[PDB]
Amino acid sequence: GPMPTPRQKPFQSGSTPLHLTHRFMVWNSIGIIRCYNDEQDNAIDVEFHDTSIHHATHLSNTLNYTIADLSHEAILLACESTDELASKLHCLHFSSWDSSKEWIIDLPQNEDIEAICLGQGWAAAATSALLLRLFTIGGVQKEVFSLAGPVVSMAGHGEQLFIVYHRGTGFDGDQCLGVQLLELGKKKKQILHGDPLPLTRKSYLAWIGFSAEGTPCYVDSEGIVRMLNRGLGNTWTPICNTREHCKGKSDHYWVVGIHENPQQLRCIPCKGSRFPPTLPRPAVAILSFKLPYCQIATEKGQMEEQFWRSVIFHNHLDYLAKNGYEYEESTKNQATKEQQELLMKMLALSCKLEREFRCVELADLMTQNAVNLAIKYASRSRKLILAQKLSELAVEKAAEL
């Protein structure tokens, strides 16, 4: 019969394989951590993206760390549970008010760290006992809970903690993963509470994290980037099949990060290997998103892609408004005006195509000012039926606005 797929070993997002004599511990927007290791010595460097965060710093890998993660508040490290020493979690809170910026924790006996991440104001790790441990940046042990399966990876941004694990057994080459998403805020909540994780056929998970604006996203082995549509009931929307940015199967991409505004994907181009060449220091490439949409060669399909790209990449403004962070409303005004002008162009093209019911549907998707301009567009060429029905739809909108 069909075989069960082997579960993929856990990874740190943006990292590189352990065995490389030089490797990148993690690529991230704050600063690049890299390591040299061989049969007789081992050392770690951190190379900050902006030196105003902190100057570049170097350490000897005294306790043989194998995992790490960075934020602009602190840098974390973690090691294996050796026979002489169980797994240790280490931190330099380099941005602290106090000079006692270093601290370390050692797990109970026969327990090993499998993943580690940072947010803002907290740290987190997932261990070999299917047990997740929260900490503060200064190393107070916060609450603890058990995971439903072995962890694949984890990430964080602000009060958001993202975990992905093996919810079950994969079959005939496909993996079987689930996702938890926790709010470590004023009220502890769990928007995703073990839901299944979509993946491309016979693929495996390759990268996770958040955009710089705090929206969760991930990439699988086929390069299809998916992002959490918070508008459509917290569901995973694809945003880029990165294979089309490649010259072919010769190339892969290793994501450094994603920016929801400006609409950018930042990654290392890699040839042959999925992970980049370890030396010399590679240069980061930047790519543009295009949502996978049908008939995209046509201008109407292209602007449909532009519209849904605009709203999906300004969902973060709604999330910022809800969570209480500072943001500028001019961004939402720009997004609404741009996507409503695009919707105006679609309505004009549909009107010229005589698909006036499609114009009324587009006007249902419109804001009131755009419906008024659509009524004027329907008045051009004297299409009175469409103009009357657009006016009626405007009245219906006014009844609720």
Add this chain to the structure above:
Amino acid sequence: GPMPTPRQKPFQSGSTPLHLTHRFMVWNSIGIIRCYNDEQDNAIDVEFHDTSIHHATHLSNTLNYTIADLSHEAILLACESTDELASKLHCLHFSSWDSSKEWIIDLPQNEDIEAICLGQGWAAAATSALLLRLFTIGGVQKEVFSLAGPVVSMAGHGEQLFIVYHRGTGFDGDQCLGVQLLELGKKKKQILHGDPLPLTRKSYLAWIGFSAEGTPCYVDSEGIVRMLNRGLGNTWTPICNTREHCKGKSDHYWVVGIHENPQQLRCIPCKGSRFPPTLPRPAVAILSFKLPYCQIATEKGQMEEQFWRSVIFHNHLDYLAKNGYEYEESTKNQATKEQQELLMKMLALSCKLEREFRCVELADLMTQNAVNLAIKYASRSRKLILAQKLSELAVEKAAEL
């Protein structure tokens, strides 16, 4: 040892398999869509149950429109991706006033289709890439999101969408199915977050859909009708073992529609098969539901079954009311009247049995007017302790209210 179950192939909701010269591609409450295919052409025939919806219509193409759906506003068809054509969706928005009396849209390369459905001004389709495509019925591309697994079937009604897919790996004949439901009104919501789908042991899903009053329902291969009981925090209540009816004289009762006002299952009696042949014209058998309540030979059990069947069906009126749609208060009043009468009559039966605690328990399920009538009955029958307990219940309810 244990054996993995093979995943079943997808089916369009309410359709026959492709292994016959003539098929029902969809049979809704609206009407029937047939397909006859041979070496000459593929002939699609639409027959409305009421011609006031629209007249009988016929299409014919070399394209094999392998998937179909029907609604009061429009007809919908779709065809698979071939070695030279990508998939295409086809529609006839017959109710329209513009030039959208026909519409065709492509889908990308390798975007093979499994199932499609219709909504109030909406349309939807599932892809072999595990992306759900959403559209307006006039034909704008709406949002896209990633499906958690291979979809087995799909359905729609109003502003709500119902999806069933393969959640994991089955074993020993059981199929590991998951269910997802979304609502797309003013606030876009996700009711079922990818939860498991109950099924009879070693059964396979045979039909899904909505009741005509707008709640999801489905039937498995053993003939067990189930529906999403939203009076129980959205759990699956079984309603009918269709193999019972007419002492199982027909080897199957191929469901085509469900109603609860009146209480009517619409189905086709099938002899020696799970589905009927498309010609000669099968007759619609109408069957009444029978919930699987215990000790059904007794008056007590029959009154219980009547009461709970009534309340699960007439709970839909409150759902329709609170979600902002039109509903009928006379039917709600009749439902309440029958429920109070059933509780009163079975209270009298339990009084005859001297099971006064059952009488108080039944009084908990009815209003203050019925409780006062029961108190006066208790006074007439000189059951003072029963009257006192009912009076204490009335005092507690009045203090709470």
Add this chain to the structure above:
Amino acid sequence: GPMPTPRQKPFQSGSTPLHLTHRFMVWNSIGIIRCYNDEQDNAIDVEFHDTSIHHATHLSNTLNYTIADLSHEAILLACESTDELASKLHCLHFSSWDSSKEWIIDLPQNEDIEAICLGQGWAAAATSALLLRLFTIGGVQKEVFSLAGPVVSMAGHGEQLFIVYHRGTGFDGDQCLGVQLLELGKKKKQILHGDPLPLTRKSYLAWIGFSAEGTPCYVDSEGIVRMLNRGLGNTWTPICNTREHCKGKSDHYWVVGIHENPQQLRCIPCKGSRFPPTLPRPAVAILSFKLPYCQIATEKGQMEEQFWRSVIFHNHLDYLAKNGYEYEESTKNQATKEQQELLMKMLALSCKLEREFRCVELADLMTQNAVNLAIKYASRSRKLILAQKLSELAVEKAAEL
């Protein structure tokens, strides 16, 4: 490679195996039910820990009941179906005011009860049709719905109904279990609606139930006790490792009850066996709960583990107050006082360690009135930056307040 596991058969909490001649059918906080079959008689003995509740009861086991549950309100019994007689549900509502304290129900033909449980005024039964049936404690049939898989066990407390089932097939020793937690109160809800249930590796589920204070809890075959953390988004927090408490690690404890205030784990030690013998009668041992924190022998570890233990246990006060159940305000006063004096001592230790950012992180959990004491403590010995930043924290808390 991996191999599928045999999904374990259903069980009942505090039972011992059916093959025994003389066994416990249930042992809980209420009392004990024993059953035996020998040449002298086939019978069931019910007895209560507090004899004021009800006298010891004895029943001839002619119908061969096999599953049982005990509550303050009633005794509930069930049997597997044989060929001539169906599976039957039997109840003794001894706390009733009417003389007809017994009632009996007979299930549909070849339907078979596989688990039962009791609650405040209701009873539940899970059957071989993957069907859960609700009854009033006086035997009126309440609502019916389909389970997502074969059950393993059930439990009830007040309005809460806790169900665990097989959501799938496990591999490589593990069991694939899902948890479903209903509330049957004034509005029907699902707190957990099929979430995966954590387990230790290669374990099986050994015990389920509620604390006396009404929080769901369970124990796996590796002796790890887990409780539902309602203050952390309804995740699962381990609260005790019974293996560390044993005289020798080959032996293990058999749980019968849980209490949060006082913190008690009620269990029976077993000499070389999974469960205790029925005679000579076991003695219930008390074990203290222990969160699995790191560096737990240090003063930091002692303080923080006690803090988190205290707060996760005193979540039940919040649940009771939110759902309208009465409670003594002295419990909340004592909980807040203990937590605050403890965290004041922890603040003193972090202050003397001169980690003032850790002090701010610790004091973030506190009320500003209590943070004023830490401000004065920082003023003592002139820890100026610590005093200033605790003052800023108090000002921010007052600004939010």
